[PDB]
């Protein structure tokens, strides 16, 4: 694999989106792999609906959290719908799915990078966006502006984002807190520091999905 990967550049990012007060960035970071997989192997990008799998999938919690993991296998079993057939409205509702016609897309399937090991994510990486997890909760982090982040941090995971690329010395993550945090909504996270859990826990949870 490549020393540097961005799928921004390959066109396989849509704009950085902002969760707002909802708990649902475990819904952006799985979405941001769904349009990532769907612009891979089709050549179409598009934005789909974070809102579909905080309402429908039945193993999250709405606004108070959910699994990346759930939402893939959602949209690999019955599939997800565009944004603007089902547009984020940051509140957990009544799952409308079955009201909004047709799904959009559809994935087969859900594969976990096997976790604590920074070459299997950057392997992934290297294939598609893949949604990963990490602490949030740090005032470093939270007021995160530039640069290669190195932390400080804990490997206490409570935040779902997407990894979009890579560096020799940092992996690239679209956050959903806006455009005005970070790098235009991104951040680069050190790695190749030895620690098996990455910095900020990074390479705790990371799952993306499988489309034929
Ligand atoms: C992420 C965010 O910052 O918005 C959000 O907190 C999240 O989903 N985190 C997530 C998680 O903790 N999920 C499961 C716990 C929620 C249990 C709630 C039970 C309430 C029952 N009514 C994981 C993936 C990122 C860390």
Do not use: M
């Amino acid at each position: 694999i490549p020393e540097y990967v961005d799928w921004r550049q390959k066109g396989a990012v849509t704009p950085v989106k902002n969760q707002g007060s909802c708990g649902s960035c475990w819904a952006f970071s799985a979405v941001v792999t769904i349009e990532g997989i769907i612009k891979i192997r089709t050549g179409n990008l598009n934005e789909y609906s974070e809102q579909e799998l905080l309402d429908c999938d039945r193993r999250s919690y709405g606004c108070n959290g959910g699994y990346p993991w759930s939402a893939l296998q959602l949209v690999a079993q019955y599939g997800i719908h565009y944004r603007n057939t089902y547009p984020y409205e940051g509140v957990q509702r009544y799952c409308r799915s079955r009201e909004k016609g047709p799904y959009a897309a559809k994935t087969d399937g859900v594969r976990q990078v096997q976790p604590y090991n920074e070459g299997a994510l950057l392997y992934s990486i290297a294939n598609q966006p893949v949604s990963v997890v990490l602490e949030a909760a740090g005032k470093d982090f939270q007021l995160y502006r530039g640069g290669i982040f190195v932390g400080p941090c804990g490997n206490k995971v409570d935040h779902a984002v997407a990894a979009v690329g890579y560096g020799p010395n940092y992996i690239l993550i679209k956050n959903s807190w806006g455009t005005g945090w970070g790098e235009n909504g991104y951040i680069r996270i050190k790695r190749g520091t030895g620690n098996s859990y990455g910095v900020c826990g990074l390479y705790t949870s990371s799952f993306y999905p499988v489309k034929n």
